[PDB]
Amino acid sequence: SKHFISKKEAKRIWEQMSRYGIDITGESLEVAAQKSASAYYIGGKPMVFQAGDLIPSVYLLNYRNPSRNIVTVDEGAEPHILNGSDLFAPGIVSMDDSIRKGDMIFVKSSKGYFIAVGMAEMDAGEVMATKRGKAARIIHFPGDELIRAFP
Template identity: 35%
Template sequence: MHKRFLSKKERRELSRTIGISEVSEILRDSDEVVLLSYDRFSLYVADGKPVLFELRGVLYPTLYILNVLLNQGREVSIPYVVVDEGAVNPLINGADVMAPGISRIARPFSKGEVVAVMHPSGRYFIVVGHALMDSRDVESVKRGKAIKNVHRLNDKIWQISLDIVRKGV
């Protein structure tokens, strides 16, 4: 792992590239943002909170920060879907989100957009990925892979995020 502190200019640029206003706000208001580079991904940590990760040139919010925002009662501006109970275990084990497993589209999305997946209870997010089809197609077709699973509860990014929160960077 390689650790590097971001300059104020880099933090401003990063906060502008994120389409999620709550995450941009956290980056802008942070005293310190650290970039942790691992073999397969990079993790951005703002004041001890893992907020973003970069995988294959794409920035995604961490499940950690999405769930923190949700638990604070803040509305999260990322597109997301709610899945049915039968989809939860396969998703946590790494499966992609299949269209029939989506019970509700909470916020519409376009193909290629970053999308979060919420547990059927509505209490927490379980997956972050990118859309393989438009939300309109998910509703009309009701078959095939809808969202590529890139980050899930209990994966390496999740475990590292929890370690950072517990022990620091």
């Protein structure tokens, strides 16, 4: 049910990920479907999900770190973010100050590794000045539906 895609098809995905500084240029990809979403694999692991928008998997985030839209959360937030909980401002340690409501964000533990992908619900300015409110909704996390669907 998987198929390696052409060089030109892969290039499109590389370019999409390069938008966030995630560098996979030159990596060959296999694609698979569920018609509710598709996944692009690198070496047997799902790396990019097509579920509305193209979403990097937490595996890709840890294999090739993004260079923008990063949000670091504290120890207390991590376990719930790992379960798909929304992200609240009080648990944010730092973040890219260029983040605006609507941007895709990449959530990382204070220990360095990435734990989820989110969609910002607030601008970085308001989050860091108030430290209150829902900063983002999580759209991908370990063991979620995307990962269960694309072993």
